[PDB]
Design an enzyme around this catalytic site. Structure first.
Site, mmCIF file in Angstrom:
data_model
loop_
_atom_site.group_PDB
_atom_site.id
_atom_site.type_symbol
_atom_site.label_atom_id
_atom_site.label_comp_id
_atom_site.label_asym_id
_atom_site.label_seq_id
_atom_site.Cartn_x
_atom_site.Cartn_y
_atom_site.Cartn_z
ATOM 1 N N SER A 141 -5.847 -5.611 -14.095
ATOM 2 C CA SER A 141 -7.040 -4.848 -13.786
ATOM 3 C C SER A 141 -7.887 -4.695 -15.038
ATOM 4 O O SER A 141 -7.365 -4.622 -16.146
ATOM 5 C CB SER A 141 -6.646 -3.470 -13.239
ATOM 6 O OG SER A 141 -7.762 -2.624 -13.053
ATOM 7 N N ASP A 195 6.908 -6.357 2.192
ATOM 8 C CA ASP A 195 7.040 -5.926 0.808
ATOM 9 C C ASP A 195 6.657 -7.044 -0.152
ATOM 10 O O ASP A 195 7.464 -7.929 -0.430
ATOM 11 C CB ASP A 195 8.496 -5.514 0.574
ATOM 12 C CG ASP A 195 8.760 -5.048 -0.827
ATOM 13 O OD1 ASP A 195 7.783 -4.805 -1.563
ATOM 14 O OD2 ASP A 195 9.955 -4.900 -1.176
HETATM 15 C C1 F91 Z 1 10.993 -1.972 -1.576
HETATM 16 C C2 F91 Z 1 12.011 -1.337 -0.894
HETATM 17 C C3 F91 Z 1 12.262 -0.004 -1.149
HETATM 18 C C4 F91 Z 1 13.404 0.702 -0.459
HETATM 19 N N1 F91 Z 1 13.210 2.137 -0.396
HETATM 20 C C5 F91 Z 1 12.285 2.683 0.462
HETATM 21 C C6 F91 Z 1 11.604 1.886 1.376
HETATM 22 C C7 F91 Z 1 10.669 2.442 2.230
HETATM 23 C C8 F91 Z 1 10.405 3.796 2.163
HETATM 24 C C9 F91 Z 1 11.065 4.599 1.218
HETATM 25 C C10 F91 Z 1 12.005 4.039 0.377
HETATM 26 O O1 F91 Z 1 10.790 5.930 1.064
HETATM 27 C C11 F91 Z 1 9.591 6.346 1.737
HETATM 28 C C12 F91 Z 1 9.525 5.749 3.108
HETATM 29 O O2 F91 Z 1 9.505 4.320 3.057
HETATM 30 C C13 F91 Z 1 11.458 0.641 -2.072
HETATM 31 C C14 F91 Z 1 10.457 -0.071 -2.705
HETATM 32 N N2 F91 Z 1 10.216 -1.366 -2.476
#
Ligand code: F91
Ligand code: F91
EC number: 3.4.23.22
Length: 330
Positions: free
Chosen positions: A199, A35
């Site tokens: 951008s 992330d």
């Molecule tokens: C970092 C962490 C999060 C936590 N929520 C999250 C993380 C992964 C996901 C999600 C939801 O929903 C779709 C599937 O993958 C959301 C955004 N950035």
């Protein structure tokens, strides 16, 4: 040193990507969501409230001979979608794709929100934004990249996300076979802790390019592309029957549509997102209303170049003394 790891979509929509990470001695392999929009490495663990674990692989620090409690340290994080997690902290050996960091802060979850529990495919997060966003208290901790960077052949990592397919995260080198043409580099502001850049504009389908500055973040941890309402309206106006639905929570479109591409500018260069990348499928099982992959940032406060945009490019996160971002077509 370098590292190279494959990253794999968690589902058929590319809602997120998981990358195997080795933690501890002997190694415990967990599949983490890399992330670039956050700065905590946290995991489901043997300390996570039992009712909040449902199929995830857990880190058990008591089984790692190299784990050490970071005494007094706690962490707590919330994300932009309202999800959250918190707990305490160990240091341990962490390896990604053959690149090893000793003494990495591994944040062990005691509590996670329901959305995490309900997703069996994600065992935690590995943050790759700037360490100034790390939530550990009272002593802020460094990201995996921040800890590795002095050892790397070059102080960089790259994201090469696949469309409905695996891709690659590399650390310490640029794979010159992984992209076409040249990489265009652009300035980054670290003032908000993100890989924040501007951008140079956009085009919809075969339309003319609109030159306009769009400040936003390169965020591998966000699924969709979030842009100003003006830009998003111009895109969806080219799709018959598309509309913004307050009940669904964004733009929806008829599943029978053929979506136009979306181009974004990086300096004088252009990255083209194919229309197919913008389809997130039925809003509920069996529906003929499909969810759009380009959405307004109006309610968020920041524009986000999430996976929909990043997967169309080879992206260099340059962690030199003055960081920059590079984008190439592929
Ligand atoms: C970092 C962490 C999060 C936590 N929520 C999250 C993380 C992964 C996901 C999600 C939801 O929903 C779709 C599937 O993958 C959301 C955004 N950035
Ligand atoms: C970004 C997560 N993916 C996704 C896919 C379909 C959806 C959705 C979200 O939220 C609204 C209903 O339809």
């Amino acid at each position: 040193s370098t590292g190279s790891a494959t990253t794999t979509p968690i589902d058929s929509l590319d809602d997120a990507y998981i990358t195997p990470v080795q933690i501890g001695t002997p190694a415990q392999t967990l599949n983490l969501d890399f992330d670039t929009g956050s700065s905590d490495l946290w995991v489901f663990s043997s300390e996570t409230t039992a009712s909040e674990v449902d199929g995830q692989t857990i880190y058990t620090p008591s089984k790692s001979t190299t784990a050490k409690l970071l005494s007094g340290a706690t962490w707590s994080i919330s994300y932009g979608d309202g999800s959250s997690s918190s707990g305490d902290v160990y240091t341990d050996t962490v390896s990604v794709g053959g690149l090893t960091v000793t003494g990495q802060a591994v944040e062990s979850a005691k509590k996670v929100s329901s959305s995490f529990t309900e997703d069996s495919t994600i065992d935690g997060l590995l943050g790759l934004a700037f360490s100034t966003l790390n939530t550990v208290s009272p002593t802020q901790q460094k990201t995996f990249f921040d800890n590795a960077k002095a050892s790397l052949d070059s102080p960089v990592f790259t994201a090469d996300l696949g469309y409905h397919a695996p891709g690659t995260y590399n650390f310490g080198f640029i794979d010159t076979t992984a992209y076409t043409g040249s990489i265009t580099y652009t300035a980054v502001s670290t003032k908000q802790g993100f890989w924040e850049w501007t951008s140079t504009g956009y085009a919809v389908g075969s339309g003319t390019f609109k030159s306009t500055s769009i400040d936003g973040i390169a965020d591998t941890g966000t699924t969709l592309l979030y842009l100003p309402a003006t830009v998003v309206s111009a895109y969806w106006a080219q799709v018959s029957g598309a509309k913004s639905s307050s009940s669904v929570g964004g733009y929806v479109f008829p599943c029978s549509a053929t979506l136009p591409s979306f181009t974004f500018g990086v300096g004088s260069a252009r990255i083209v997102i194919p229309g197919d990348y913008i389809d997130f499928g039925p809003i509920s099982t069996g529906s003929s209303s499909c969810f759009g992959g380009i959405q307004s940032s109006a309610g968020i406060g920041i524009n986000i170049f999430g996976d929909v945009a990043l997967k169309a490019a080879f992206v260099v996160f340059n962690g030199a003394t003055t960081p920059t971002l590079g984008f190439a077509s592929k």
